[model samples]
Target: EQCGRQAGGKLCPNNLCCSQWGWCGSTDEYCSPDHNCQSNCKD
Candidate 1:
């Protein structure tokens, strides 16, 4: 799902990370702080 406040408040399912661009996934681009994840970021 698409996430972040700009994307209508949709949240990622399960443990998936929401990228800065508002997409949901588990890759580095979605979960990494370096990539600026907007929510559900992995530590």
Candidate 2:
């Protein structure tokens, strides 16, 4: 599912990262704080 404030305010599921671009994922581009994750970011 999509996430972030712009994406209908839906939080990422299964501990996935909510990317700055409003998508759910787990890659560095999605979960890295340096990448500007909106929520559920992890090292």
Candidate 3:
């Protein structure tokens, strides 16, 4: 991952996830630990 790639990062610091451009969910989708752990706001 590059800079601002994770939830703590600038891009998703607001507690969100980064997907592979319409891989499963929509773009700018907030991540969850079960499906998207890295973007889990509670993580």
Candidate 4:
């Protein structure tokens, strides 16, 4: 989530994880970054 969810969209919600599939979640799977980035992953 360094940028947007997809090409141009709202970023992942706070505490949620960003997946390599350009999605958001709170699970470990969504935390992957194969192609996507971790948005708001700061603590």
Whole-model Cα lDDT of every candidate shown, in order? 0.86, 0.89, 0.35, 0.55
- Best of the candidates, lDDT: 2
lDDT of 2: 0.89
Poorly placed runs, candidate 4 (over 4 Å)? 1-5, 32-37, 41-43
Model 4 pairs whose backbones collide: 1-37, 1-39, 17-25
When 1 and 2 are scored with lDDT, the better candidate is 2
Q: What is the per-residue lDDT of model 3 for residues 1-43, given as tens digits with 9 covering 90 to 100?
A: 4213432343443334444221222233434444442333333
Across 1-43, the per-residue lDDT of candidate 4 in tens digits comes to: 3325463656765756666556677555665454344564422
Least lDDT summed over 10 consecutive residues: which range in candidate 1?
1-10
Among all candidates shown, the one with the greatest TM-score: 2
Model 3 gets an lDDT of 0.35
lDDT of 2 by residue, 1-43 (tens): 4899878888988988999899999998999999999899987
lDDT of 1 by residue, 1-43 (tens): 4788768877888868999889999999999999999888986
Instruction: Give the per-residue Cα lDDT of candidate 2 at 9.
Output: 80
Runs in model 1 with CA error above 4 Å?
none
Q: State which candidate, 2 or 4, has the greater TM-score.
A: 2
Better of 1 and 4 by lDDT: 1
Consecutive 10-residue window with the lowest summed lDDT within model 2: 1-10
Name the regions of candidate 2 deviating beyond 4 angstroms: none
Q: How many residue pairs clash in model 1?
A: 0
Give the higher-lDDT candidate: 2 or 4.
2
